[PDB]
Specification:
This protein is an alpha+beta fold. The chain folds into two domains: 254 residues, DD-peptidase/beta-lactamase superfamily (Beta-lactamase, 3-Layer(aba) Sandwich), CATH 3.40.710; 92 residues, Peptidoglycan synthesis regulatory factor (PBP3), Domain 2 (Sandwich). It contains seven helices and 17 strands. The protein binds the ligand *C(=O)[C@@H](NC(=O)[C@H](N)c1ccccc1)[C@@H]1N[C@@H](C(=O)O)C(C)(C)S1. It is classed as hydrolase.
């Protein structure tokens, strides 16, 4: 119980990447229009298309009139690559335009290429939003132009950040790039913390919300540890960055993340009744990391209970059959599902 810092913003969250532990939070479930932070999910979707080899970096995309000054009034004086209809631009360039420059026209040109239309692309964004448990998130645009019925929260942004990092790492990697050059002009990354001396920050996106102020979703690493911070509705650009750096620095200073039960590791083996095998391996799967105050590892204790007195087949990989309890000094700090690590079908 280290005292959480004061944060000079509307809402915030600080989350450990490996354990999911929420180290600090304020109004983290309050709904706000995510505006430019939407492009985190745009990039998630494009990243999935690339990872699935449905599109390739080298593919040449034809820019449509929906991607233009003239032919889309909604792009009017937003951040833009200055694409024109009939332009041919690589997926790689449009991708960097979304990620590094946050260009709204690039989002549209990519969305059309990936999904056929903005509308079908927004469908994919919301599909993933549901899949990732972003329970307070709905996207209504491919570019995050403020829009009716478009909402997210600090919590959901940190979960989405975590997913981008974990699920499409090649796409995440582009978020630390300080510049890229298109049409022979350098376009800088607006994430000032990429230049921070005091932290290794490698992502991920800035924005504003009408009526709330300046936002940042950031992530940083220090040794084995990665933290994700979200700061929403800071009053100034300076505060937006500073309060983020404060939270990240605080997390690494006072906490450590350890993984007592590795993924794939067997925590305990239990007899099974009526199965094709007489025993089954149980473990934590991906949920075996915990974040604790520094110096506490020596006092960390892992134990288990089973929900039923005896396991009976069939058992499936991932099935929950009890709870793993982590205790610090006799006191329980974390519980996780005890899961089946291997299939055991019914005998016979
Ligand atoms: C995303 O949220 C963007 N914000 C806007 O497009 C706003 N409509 C806007 C705010 C202030 C001035 C002009 C437009 C991008 N995020 C901003 C930021 O992080 O400060 C931006 C100005 C770089 S554009």
């Amino acid at each position: 119980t280290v005292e959480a810092p004061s944060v000079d913003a509307r809402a915030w969250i600080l989350m450990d990447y490996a354990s999911g532990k929420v180290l600090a939070e304020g109004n983290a479930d309050e709904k706000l229009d995510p505006a430019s932070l939407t492009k985190i999910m745009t990039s998630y979707v494009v990243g999935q298309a690339l990872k699935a080899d449905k599109i390739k970096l080298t593919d040449m995309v034809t820019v449509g009139k929906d991607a233009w000054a003239t032919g889309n009034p909604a792009l009017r004086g937003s951040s833009v690559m200055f694409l024109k209809p009939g332009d041919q631009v690589s997926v790689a360039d449009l991708n960097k335009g979304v990620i590094i420059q946050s260009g709204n026209d690039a989002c549209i040109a990519l969305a059309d290429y990936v999904a056929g239309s903005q509308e079908s692309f927004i469908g994919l964004m919301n599909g993933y939003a549901k899949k990732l448990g972003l329970t307070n998130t709905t996207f209504q645009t491919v570019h995050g132009l403020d829009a009716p019925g478009q909402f997210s929260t600090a919590r959901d942004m940190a979960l989405l950040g975590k997913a981008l990092i974990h699920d499409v790492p090649e796409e995440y990697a582009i978020h630390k790039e300080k510049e890229f050059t298109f049409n022979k002009i350098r376009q800088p990354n607006r994430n000032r913390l990429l230049w921070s001396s005091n932290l290794n920050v490698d992502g991920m996106k800035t924005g504003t919300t009408a009526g709330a102020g300046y936002n940042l979703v950031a992530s940083a690493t220090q040794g084995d540890m990665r933290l994700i911070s979200v700061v929403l509705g800071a009053k100034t650009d300076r505060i937006r960055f500073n309060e983020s750096e404060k939270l990240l620095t605080w997390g690494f200073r006072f906490f450590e993340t350890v993984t007592p039960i590795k993924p794939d590791a067997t925590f305990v083996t239990q007899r099974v009744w009526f199965g094709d095998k007489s025993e089954v391996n149980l473990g934590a799967g991906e949920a075996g990391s915990v974040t604790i105050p520094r110096g506490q590892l020596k006092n960390l204790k892992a134990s288990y209970t089973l929900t039923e007195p005896q396991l009976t087949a069939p058992l499936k990989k991932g099935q929950v059959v009890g709870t793993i309890d982590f205790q610090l000094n006799g006191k329980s700090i974390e519980q996780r599902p005890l899961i089946v690590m291997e299939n055991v079908e019914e005998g016979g």
